[PDB]
Amino acid sequence: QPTDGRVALEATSGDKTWEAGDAIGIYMLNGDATDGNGNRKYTTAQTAENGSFTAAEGQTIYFPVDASQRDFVAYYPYRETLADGNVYTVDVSVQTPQKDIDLMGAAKVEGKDKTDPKVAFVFTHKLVKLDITIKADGTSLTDADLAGTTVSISNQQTAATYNVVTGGDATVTTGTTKEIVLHTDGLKAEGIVLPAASTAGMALTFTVPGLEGQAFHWDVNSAAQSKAFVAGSKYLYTITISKAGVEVSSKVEDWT
Numbered sequence: 001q002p003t004d005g006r007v008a009l010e011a012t013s014g015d016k017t018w019e020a021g022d023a024i025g026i027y028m029l030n031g032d033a034t035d036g037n038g039n040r041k042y043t044t045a046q047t048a049e050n051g052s053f054t055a056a057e058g059q060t061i062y063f064p065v066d067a068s069q070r071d072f073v074a075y076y077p078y079r080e081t082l083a084d085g086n087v088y089t090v091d092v093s094v095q096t097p098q099k100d101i102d103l104m105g106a107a108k109v110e111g112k113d114k115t116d117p118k119v120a121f122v123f124t125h126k127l128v129k130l131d132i133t134i135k136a137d138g139t140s141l142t143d144a145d146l147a148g149t150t151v152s153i154s155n156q157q158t159a160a161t162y163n164v165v166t167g168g169d170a171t172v173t174t175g176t177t178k179e180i181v182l183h184t185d186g187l188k189a190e191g192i193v194l195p196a197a198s199t200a201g202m203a204l205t206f207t208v209p210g211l212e213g214q215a216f217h218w219d220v221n222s223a224a225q226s227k228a229f230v231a232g233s234k235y236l237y238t239i240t241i242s243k244a245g246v247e248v249s250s251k252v253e254d255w256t
């Protein structure tokens, strides 16, 4: 904090939630108008859920000296240049690293002034997380037989937009449907995909090298918990693979 009376924003996200260097863009608003430069770069060095953010040099947001109130919004991951009108363009074609496509928005924090400059940003994911666990039936196949299994999801939209000042939901901008290869780490696969009103036509493909590269297909819409992909949710699938085919158990959770 300065020693010549100016009151800087004290930003927090209030064990392994963030990673050192993670950056957010903050806006201080007077109604709909951006007060000063928007998209101010703030970073964290803390990993904890209650981690504090620090302004990049020359990016510090100061409260109005007249003690009038302002509102605050933020988004992750920070982009130096947004599309015209404070718009974040989503592209989920490239899955790795997951953190670089994990778009999050902080709920608007209203009516703050220099007498209480602490703003606790609560971020929510704007996209959808897929968390897949693969296991063998233990009869026709063993977990060892599934070593190297790859996972992909079909007929995906890959482009969306999000206004970082407006908040609310991301909007899918329809284009040509694509197969998205999910990131695998042993018998675990993960992905970040766009929200979808219907999962019809979407299938998970499991290519098992052990079974001479044989591919198993499973319809996402056949699961009880995923007739749609809801923004800010995590879909957990447990895939049991047998020579006769695959079986899946599903769970949906708020993504946290």
Ligand SMILES: [Cl-]
Binding pocket: 095, 096, 097, 098, 099, 183
């Ligand atoms: Cl990753």
